[PDB]
Amino acid sequence: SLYREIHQLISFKDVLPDKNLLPDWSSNKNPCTFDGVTCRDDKVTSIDLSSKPLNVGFSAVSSSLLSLTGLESLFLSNSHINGSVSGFKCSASLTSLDLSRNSLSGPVTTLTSLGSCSGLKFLNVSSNTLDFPGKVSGGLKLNSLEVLDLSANSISGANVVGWVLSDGCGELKHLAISGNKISGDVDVSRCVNLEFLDVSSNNFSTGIPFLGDCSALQHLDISGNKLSGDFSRAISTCTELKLLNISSNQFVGPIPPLPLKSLQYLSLAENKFTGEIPDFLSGACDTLTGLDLSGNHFYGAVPPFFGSCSLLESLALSSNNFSGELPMDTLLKMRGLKVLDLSFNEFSGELPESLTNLSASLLTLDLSSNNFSGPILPNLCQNPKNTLQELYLQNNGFTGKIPPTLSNCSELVSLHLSFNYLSGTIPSSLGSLSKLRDLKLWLNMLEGEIPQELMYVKTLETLILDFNDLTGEIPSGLSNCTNLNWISLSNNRLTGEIPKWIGRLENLAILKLSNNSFSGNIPAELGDCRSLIWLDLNTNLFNGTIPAAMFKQSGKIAANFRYVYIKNDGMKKECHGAGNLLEFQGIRSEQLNRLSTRNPCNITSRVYSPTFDNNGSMMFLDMSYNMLSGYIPKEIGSMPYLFILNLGHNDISGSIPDEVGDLRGLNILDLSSNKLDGRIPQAMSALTMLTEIDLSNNNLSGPIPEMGQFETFPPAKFLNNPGLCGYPLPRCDP
Numbered sequence: 001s002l003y004r005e006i007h008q009l010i011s012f013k014d015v016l017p018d019k020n021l022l023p024d025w026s027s028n029k030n031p032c033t034f035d036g037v038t039c040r041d042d043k044v045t046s047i048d049l050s051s052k053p054l055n056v057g058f059s060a061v062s063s064s065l066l067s068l069t070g071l072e073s074l075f076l077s078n079s080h081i082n083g084s085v086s087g088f089k090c091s092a093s094l095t096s097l098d099l100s101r102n103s104l105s106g107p108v109t110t111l112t113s114l115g116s117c118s119g120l121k122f123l124n125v126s127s128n129t130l131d132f133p134g135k136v137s138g139g140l141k142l143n144s145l146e147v148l149d150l151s152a153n154s155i156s157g158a159n160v161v162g163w164v165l166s167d168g169c170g171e172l173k174h175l176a177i178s179g180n181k182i183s184g185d186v187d188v189s190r191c192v193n194l195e196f197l198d199v200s201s202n203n204f205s206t207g208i209p210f211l212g213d214c215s216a217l218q219h220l221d222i223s224g225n226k227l228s229g230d231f232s233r234a235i236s237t238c239t240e241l242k243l244l245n246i247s248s249n250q251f252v253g254p255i256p257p258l259p260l261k262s263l264q265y266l267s268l269a270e271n272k273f274t275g276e277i278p279d280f281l282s283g284a285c286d287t288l289t290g291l292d293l294s295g296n297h298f299y300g301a302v303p304p305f306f307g308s309c310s311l312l313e314s315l316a317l318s319s320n321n322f323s324g325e326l327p328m329d330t331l332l333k334m335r336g337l338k339v340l341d342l343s344f345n346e347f348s349g350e351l352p353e354s355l356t357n358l359s360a361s362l363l364t365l366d367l368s369s370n371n372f373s374g375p376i377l378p379n380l381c382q383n384p385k386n387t388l389q390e391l392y393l394q395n396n397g398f399t400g401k402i403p404p405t406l407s408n409c410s411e412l413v414s415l416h417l418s419f420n421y422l423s424g425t426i427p428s429s430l431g432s433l434s435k436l437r438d439l440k441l442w443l444n445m446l447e448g449e450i451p452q453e454l455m456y457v458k459t460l461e462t463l464i465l466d467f468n469d470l471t472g473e474i475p476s477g478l479s480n481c482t483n484l485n486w487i488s489l490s491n492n493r494l495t496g497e498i499p500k501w502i503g504r505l506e507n508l509a510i511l512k513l514s515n516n517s518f519s520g521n522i523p524a525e526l527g528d529c530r531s532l533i534w535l536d537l538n539t540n541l542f543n544g545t546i547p548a549a550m551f552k553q554s555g556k557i558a559a560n561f562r563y564v565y566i567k568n569d570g571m572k573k574e575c576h577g578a579g580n581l582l583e584f585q586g587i588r589s590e591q592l593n594r595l596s597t598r599n600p601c602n603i604t605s606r607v608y609s610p611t612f613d614n615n616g617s618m619m620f621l622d623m624s625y626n627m628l629s630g631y632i633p634k635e636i637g638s639m640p641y642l643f644i645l646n647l648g649h650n651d652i653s654g655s656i657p658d659e660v661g662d663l664r665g666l667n668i669l670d671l672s673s674n675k676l677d678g679r680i681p682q683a684m685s686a687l688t689m690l691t692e693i694d695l696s697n698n699n700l701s702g703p704i705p706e707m708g709q710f711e712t713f714p715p716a717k718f719l720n721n722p723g724l725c726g727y728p729l730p731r732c733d734p
């Protein structure tokens, strides 16, 4: 017996490709001492080899492990098991089998073989590649199961649920098959003990699941399909219902009657429900902990009855047309509230003083994209121990100043005050927000300098201050913020140079400094930013030459890195640069016209990516409209991910490096308005991704390369080059 146990386990170990995996599994040694093994009274009862790259087929598993007498559970989640299940001798003692997150493949009918495990009651085969080929007939025939998870497979087809349940489901308590492409009907009316049903993210577009008496159902998730019928009538017999998730479908009309007496979580998000919030929902106030109505067509006010929902932790009403003043009278009674999301509505008026009390309970306050006005509450975080982590007030009409008292929201992780009409300075006291990761204040009328005090915020990742009236230089304090990964200061009136300490921000992925008055040379230390993929310096007063060293990472960039990209059309003179990459969270695109008084560019063309290992490269480089000079370092050509390169409008001379032809990712290439001479390198015919080029206003000569993409570009892209010829230009005179 021990003999048999140890021979089975060691035989399993020996079939493993990796010889480091079960280092302590050893023959002539008791398995009860092995890692991965659970024993009771010196007998093996469970094996857990999850998250270990075994790289063997199911046949090895069923041969060795599943035949172990007395084995009660086997956990092999994320263990690189492949192959298919099939017939094997299986212990009567085995009650749970977890094969999730593997590479099991073949028709789901293979699972019928697990019927040989007479004791099997729990089965997880989620996140594999099981499918259902053609004719959906017969049955799964595992009607002893209490729990079955077939989620995230490759099951495509109609009435697969009927197939799962055809042979009986009187024992079933938990059915999940989410994340497939199943369609048709769901009939669980004979599953009288079913407590959990998840058919979400599938291809259901016809009937609502038929639940029958719905006598044990507590959790119902049909979200992420295309359903439109009468779910209300479907769930009306479900008196045990705690979670109802019908989000991301195609339901319409007003919120219908619902079974409210046991309800904890309700989501109707992402449908087309209309009307006001009806007062009958009040019946769930004894139990309701989470409510989500986001992304519908609701309107009107927030009903006073919400005052009695004392257990409500989360109220999400974003993206509707709710209106009126902040219903503080009601919000104050919601003892339990931690998340309040009213963003993307039409709430208006000023912030009430009572709101300050909420700083004491909420973790998240989201009022972004409404019609609020007036000052931001000076006293907001006045309470002894405020919990507030996220404060989103962006895209409103707030006036006045940023209250220094926000330094008292001690747990603040994210502060978004962008797209308002705030004036005054950036309070130095935000320096004492020791956990702050995101500071976003762009598109306001902020003045003064960038607080040196930010140097106290070690956690800082995001500093977005575009479109203000900020002056002075980049404070050396920012050098201490080594987790900065996104710095954006475009469209201020800043001065001075890029500090060389810039080099020691190994996480900086985006540096946008356009339309200021920065000067001096480009620091070669820029090449020491191990994360830099987006460098925008257009429209400044930079000078000197381009440092080859700034490219010395093209390189071992580990990985890649919520925004809007607004492309410059090329029909406006006063509009400079390839285009603006701007932070765009909780902001309506409709309000982008608010830039009209700051930005000479049109705003019509709004846009919202590769994968790296250690191959990653700079993706975006724009240094146009400066006073640069010298020669383009041929290292310029070392960036296979560079899809944009704008060096237009400088005083760059010498010839175009042939290495430019190595930039296989290049879509845009602007080198117009410079002192460039010599021949356009033939190598540039290798580029096949170009959508725009400009080499006009240089001193280029010789023929335009006959191959590549040149012929597809108009004469304009080549004008003002005396000795240049060849189509699209006039034929060269040999």
Ligand SMILES: *[C@@H]1O[C@H](CO)[C@@H](O[C@@H]2O[C@H](CO)[C@@H](O[C@@H]3O[C@H](CO)[C@@H](O[C@@H]4O[C@H](CO)[C@@H](O)[C@H](O)[C@H]4NC(C)=O)[C@H](O)[C@H]3NC(C)=O)[C@H](O)[C@H]2NC(C)=O)[C@H](O)[C@H]1NC(C)=O
Pocket (backbone or CB within 6 Å): 491, 515, 539, 574, 575, 576, 596, 597, 598, 599, 600, 601
């Ligand atoms: C770098 O930054 C500076 C400073 O922000 C920026 O200069 C500013 O640019 C804007 C846009 O060109 C100017 O626009 C002001 O406001 C309106 C836009 O709504 C301008 O255009 C029209 O104004 C008339 C007024 O009667 C109006 O009827 C019309 O509807 C407007 N057209 C629209 C809808 O676009 C005005 O010309 C102008 N108003 C004033 C103050 O006279 C700002 O004035 C500029 N502010 C300055 C110069 O400090 C500059 O363009 C940026 N550079 C780059 C390359 O982006």
Ligand SMILES: *[C@@H]1O[C@H](CO)[C@@H](O[C@@H]2O[C@H](CO)[C@@H](O[C@@H]3O[C@H](CO)[C@@H](O)[C@H](O)[C@H]3NC(C)=O)[C@H](O)[C@H]2NC(C)=O)[C@H](O)[C@H]1NC(C)=O
Pocket (backbone or CB within 6 Å): 077, 100, 101, 124, 125, 126, 127, 147, 148, 149, 174, 176
């Ligand atoms: C079948 O196997 C699946 C794959 O393991 C299970 O899916 C996983 O279940 C976990 C529990 O729900 C999830 O845990 C995550 O990690 C933390 C750990 O502390 C949890 O709190 C979170 O709920 C969850 N993620 C976070 C951070 O929110 C796994 O995420 C989840 N993975 C998925 C969904 O693919 C199934 O649960 C299992 N089925 C059954 C019936 O047991």
Ligand SMILES: *[C@@H]1O[C@H](CO)[C@@H](O[C@@H]2O[C@H](CO)[C@@H](O)[C@H](O)[C@H]2NC(C)=O)[C@H](O)[C@H]1NC(C)=O
Pocket (backbone or CB within 6 Å): 156, 157, 181, 183, 203, 205
């Ligand atoms: C799920 O959505 C619908 C419904 O099954 C599928 O649309 C079908 O498209 C095929 C053509 O490939 C037609 O033969 C079917 O008649 C369509 N269905 C109907 C009723 O119009 C869609 O293909 C399915 N998606 C997947 C990936 O399974």
Ligand SMILES: *[C@@H]1O[C@H](CO)[C@@H](O[C@@H]2O[C@H](CO)[C@@H](O)[C@H](O)[C@H]2NC(C)=O)[C@H](O)[C@H]1NC(C)=O
Pocket (backbone or CB within 6 Å): 200, 201, 221, 223, 224, 245, 246, 247, 248, 265, 267
């Ligand atoms: C209700 O259903 C939605 C849609 O299935 C769930 O949202 C999913 O997970 C997150 C949001 O939490 C998003 O990524 C998507 O909207 C959904 N899935 C994916 C992978 O995109 C939501 O979590 C469900 N709510 C509950 C509590 O069950």
Ligand SMILES: *[C@@H]1O[C@H](CO)[C@@H](O[C@@H]2O[C@H](CO)[C@@H](O)[C@H](O)[C@H]2NC(C)=O)[C@H](O)[C@H]1NC(C)=O
Pocket (backbone or CB within 6 Å): 519, 520, 521, 542, 543, 544
């Ligand atoms: C870039 O701008 C700076 C600051 O205005 C200038 O610094 C120049 O540096 C070199 C030193 O040999 C010379 O061009 C001048 O002596 C400096 N000018 C002055 C008085 O500041 C200069 O305009 C630009 N620097 C470069 C590299 O040309």
Ligand SMILES: *[C@@H]1O[C@H](CO)[C@@H](O)[C@H](O)[C@H]1NC(C)=O
Pocket (backbone or CB within 6 Å): 055, 056, 057, 082, 083, 084
């Ligand atoms: C299972 O994985 C191994 C390891 O790569 C491979 O050799 C074998 O062909 C795979 N079997 C199937 C069914 O793909």
Ligand SMILES: *[C@@H]1O[C@H](CO)[C@@H](O)[C@H](O)[C@H]1NC(C)=O
Pocket (backbone or CB within 6 Å): 299, 321, 322, 323, 346
């Ligand atoms: C939203 O509500 C406001 C205030 O009642 C109303 O004036 C406006 O027309 C509504 N907007 C839409 C899109 O229905």
Ligand SMILES: *[C@@H]1O[C@H](CO)[C@@H](O)[C@H](O)[C@H]1NC(C)=O
Pocket (backbone or CB within 6 Å): 455, 456, 479, 480
């Ligand atoms: C950051 O600046 C330097 C880093 O070497 C040093 O004075 C100190 O460690 C830091 N200062 C602060 C504000 O912690």
